[PDB]
Design a protein around this ligand. Structure first.
Ligand code: E8U
Ligand code: E8U
Ligand code: E8U
Ligand code: E8U
Ligand code: E8U
Ligand code: E8U
Ligand code: MG
Ligand code: MG
Ligand code: MG
Ligand code: MG
Ligand code: MG
Ligand code: MG
Lengths: 251, 251, 251, 251, 251, 251
């Protein structure tokens, strides 16, 4: 049950990802064989729940691509449920300060290091108690990634980076640009500057910078600055744009 | 993506509605062709979730009847998820004061006017970014209806009506009568008086009064007093009572 | 595991029924408490399969109303699957002659009386081998009802009535009227006479006549004539018509 | 309930299509807004059934793109069920001769023109008896497309083209090439000639030629030759190839 | 709608239970016929939600085994939703003090005794208003069981036992042992002592002690000390261990 | 895409199996980790379809246990659909003679060796055209197992064994005993002799004998005799019996 995504980040190996919002175990398997290092199962902005996350994890399992799950918010109860169905890497939205980052971390760890509720007999996480000493091994294989999405979060970045258990910090350009006054449009120089400065700062602390960016030139720019988990497209977008282009070429 | 239900309320056109608690995209389509101005998809008192709301919205889409969705509570996270699958008109339960009404409104609006999280690439709401300038157009087509269900809420009605973005105020007779000490039985004169006084007061402020009432005489009475969104039946009730009556006529 | 619907037909007690086309375990429970003697789960003209039949049987189980299932056709494989999830009373469409009636009967019976495949360990039918001597008790509690829907079938009715195991014969006025050249108008005198004559002939043979008819006056006529399983309405119709009428009363 | 796809074929307007194998009502809606004239819901080679077809029809309904459904085979029972959930245009696989083409046609038509079973009260097809005179209007809006996939079928093409009710003939290059001894390589000259000759012959008979081809140059050739319903891509392929290419650009 | 599990506890009749984490209405029915007094539908540590709880309640209904439901946390909104689909006995996790116990109780009761929201027309709980005077009868048939899972909870046990409406107190050995510093391993003498002392103390107050324990010797020991609701196994464990043992016996 | 179960039979390595009738992707994963060589997903006697087979295959995929699928009957259409979602090993019920065995084999093979329809772009089988030369590699990795369940089939066994492509012959004791006049009691000497003799004859022909038997002593006897794929239990039975026994130990 070693977390290979977590190990790759710690070793400074950049991980190229794809965002999954189609909310389907079928398309999830199809995309799990496409060659990405990681796949983001979005429980915040796509119609997913614990049950559909579970089936997407099952679909993805035999492939090399590693699953990352985003809960709808920094909720210890939801986090608990996602962990028990087998989630090991979390992308937690709207983390505003060090306290909230710490809460996210503690929600993924069994006491005394955290408040994770025990239910291994019932959980896919322990393979229903087949994994020996699961309760002792689980904490170390949890990978917690926190999203900074506001000016407030940006101010607090230094303290957030000081939180043990925070393995990565993800910058969401859409929410960030909106909070900065550019209505979801990240292209503006002020937004780009904040993003790139944060990436440098995150990597400087030894933690992993992450971002979602569909512009491939910007993706490489972010990678060059030291970003370690970079999602470079979204399944819904890839499908819609390719279908639209195709239709247009035939009038 | 113009909100026609919202426009109708603002123009003082009464909207006749049906409550949907069958939690099925199939019966939802069947009822969408029955001639109602609006349909209430109940996520509070029927076994619905974001996923089943989505399929009921899809079923209803091609019909003239306009969908309204009730979340299980005034939860910004749940509200966010419902909006992204395409919800534009919300009926928010247990709004007790102006602060809570304001929170409901802000949960439906992108910054700076609100705290709505951005995820349009993934969302049916923007038709996966097919709607041009979606982020700039969305706020104005959101219609927020708040429920007053207690004596406390009734005291605070004047302040609630002062909240910008509150387009309508819905009175729930069941909860209200229970809170007033008449165990869900709204017939009592004290309950009726509170209801009718509120309706007059709501309309006086230029906002839309709403109510659910299965008694058709009371429905017309409420309409006469200026109610603008009136649900006049419930799918489960219509089905159960008609089936029971039918069976009884054959012994 | 006694088939009470079968026993009632055999004792000449008329059974009043409702047709279920909403294909939902939820509305199925709601209607199971409405007071009908039987409920028809329609696998021919509603979007059902073995799986949704199963969930509707589970929903109905604790209520007095007895379930009857209609497969999409006289198919031994499908019949086998429906029996194993617990179906004891079948309504088989488009039975044209004695050979086809005999095939329907034999599909429901274990060898040597029939060709029903054995899989009791797996099946809800035996409550997973919890019912003692299930393999010996099963055959006698199967109730086979065959549909006559064409002039050819009407002609072969005497022979169909002579098939052992055919417990009842159901007349579908819609299909019959269509075959007679009056598509969708069973009202025509020639159709009503054929129906009346069939009902009398069936009852005189010592077997149960059945029919679906939404017109309550005709239903009572057929009951007067000796029909023993009479469905007097359809769930989709009850709901649609009640809803449309309600909407109309408010313009 | 007018069949606009059928009308377009009859008027000689070419229809550009996309194949749907993702078996999801969600991705179906996403693609329904992409600008295609028609969408093929594949019940033969994708994991669909009557139920998932229904939800995909509901998702597609409000969009301009017209749905076409392929049953798993030329099965009158399955065809009956697909029609009742609202299917008006069918693509029937493995039609080998005129008799089988005639059977396909008659499965879609009410007596006396066909053997379609009557169940309008229950069916989305008539919007639950809300469409007036449905039983009289239905036959004329059915559009039957038959697949020729073997040398035997090619030989019988003249006779198949003479069957009234066969509105179009579709050539499946994959199956045809396999039958001709070039499994999975329609590129071979002998195959292309057979395809071209069939298209010309179909169009000259006054009926619509159809084909699926992912190669955009060949698609344009077949259109040049007079093909009237041409699917130019497959959803699973578009998604898989776009995703794989994206991943490859980042190594 | 009498709560027989609740009555049995009040009468001091021990109830033997099985834990359900397979999250399936099918296996739930299979196990409902296995002879247990109660069944725990786990919404905290198994992938269940309100919808799947509903279908498991439907599956279990006709059997003697009584359903108990565990929500994911002490959430009044979730509790409301579970009650309306028909839940009457709740096992509430992580109850730390008398205030939290009181909140749990009040969430299950209609005003004035609680804050339960009224929606009986829509609810399976009232059988869609078929149960006469449901609103007046419901409160008394609610059975609230609270879990004590930490040292803090243990300190507060005396006050928790003083809370009216708390019918039972459940000790979770896994969480408790973890909080005490024995990583989910309850065997340690310190854990066992706390557990047995609590059981004696709970029963002394006239309330029901409960526990889950797969060790059958420990189960009888707890019963001897006065425990009244004792779950003696878990469906996932029973299945996994039996399958593993079987496979091993054949190499 | 190599069929390891097929290779093992061919090499004479006995394969120990478990029957899956719980029809759940969740319990399927749980059991896939229990150490069996193969798992039988039953589409004949459990409520499965192509869709649930697909999800069970996805759940099982990362585990060593190899999936085998039983269609509801020897149906080329259904077989086609099962193969396209990725089924490589089939257990075909009620194969009565050599012609039917040959039909089963040809349904699994692309022309000219068979009649398998081509749809690789759409199918999980080729991982959506990601497996190179799939159309050329597929035939050889198909493994066809036929069930003999009647005296007629026993009589035709020598001819069935002569059909190329029949890799194994499975004896179902329940159905066979029923056909021989001992319904549900394979224990009878005449039945055991028929079974033993069939196993020997199958193995002597150079093909794999198979059987399901819950009695562990008989299983070992059949293995001794040369049976190569032996299912030694059923998931529903294991669960039901373990649960019932546990409940009984507490009275
Ligand atoms: O492109 C989108 O709108 C969908 C994904 C975002 O919500 C990802 C995110 O967290 C962010 O960058 O704000
Ligand atoms: O009639 C019912 O009980 C169902 C709907 C209510 O919850 C609607 C509501 O909000 C209220 O009037 O309290
Ligand atoms: O009223 C309808 O058309 C719907 C149900 C029929 O399929 C009933 C039937 O079997 C028949 O009357 O032919
Ligand atoms: O491209 C593929 O192989 C997938 C779709 C086919 O089934 C289309 C078809 O009907 C044919 O070309 O034989
Ligand atoms: O055995 C398990 O881990 C599954 C069930 C527990 O979460 C039950 C519980 O509440 C407890 O004893 O901590
Ligand atoms: O034990 C049972 O009856 C359930 C499984 C059978 O269908 C297995 C089978 O194929 C046979 O033995 O006839
Ligand atoms: Mg964001
Ligand atoms: Mg209310
Ligand atoms: Mg009929
Ligand atoms: Mg083809
Ligand atoms: Mg616990
Ligand atoms: Mg068998």
């Amino acid at each position: 049950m070693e977390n290979s995504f977590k190990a790759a980040l710690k070793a400074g190996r950049p991980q190229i990802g794809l965002w999954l919002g189609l909310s389907s175990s079928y398309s999830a398997e199809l995309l799990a064989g496409a060659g990405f290092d990681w796949l983001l199962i979005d429980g915040e902005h796509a119609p997913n729940n614990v049950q559909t996350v579970l089936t997407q994890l099952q679909a993805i399992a035999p492939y090399p691509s590693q699953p990352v799950v985003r809960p709808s918010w920094n909720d210890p109860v939801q986090i608990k449920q996602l962990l028990d169905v087998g989630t090991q890497t979390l992308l937690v939205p709207m983390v505003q300060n060090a306290d909230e980052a710490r809460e996210a971390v503690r929600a993924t760890r069994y006491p005394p290091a955290g408040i994770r509720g025990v239910g291994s007999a019932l959980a896919r996480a322990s393979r229903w108690n087949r994994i020996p000493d699961y309760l002792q091994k689980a904490n170390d294989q949890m990978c917690v990634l926190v999203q900074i999405e506001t000016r407030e979060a940006m101010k607090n970045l230094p303290q957030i980076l000081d939180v043990e258990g925070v393995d990565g910090v993800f910058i969401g350009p859409a929410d960030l640009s909106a909070d900065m006054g550019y209505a979801g449009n990240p292209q503006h120089p002020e937004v780009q500057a904040a993003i790139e400065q944060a990436i440098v700062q995150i990597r400087e602390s030894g933690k992993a910078p992450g971002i979602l960016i569909a512009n491939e030139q910007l993706a490489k720019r972010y990678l060059e600055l030291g970003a370690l988990f970079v999602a470079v497209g979204v399944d819904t977008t890839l499908l819609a744009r390719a279908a639209e282009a195709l239709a247009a070429r035939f009038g």
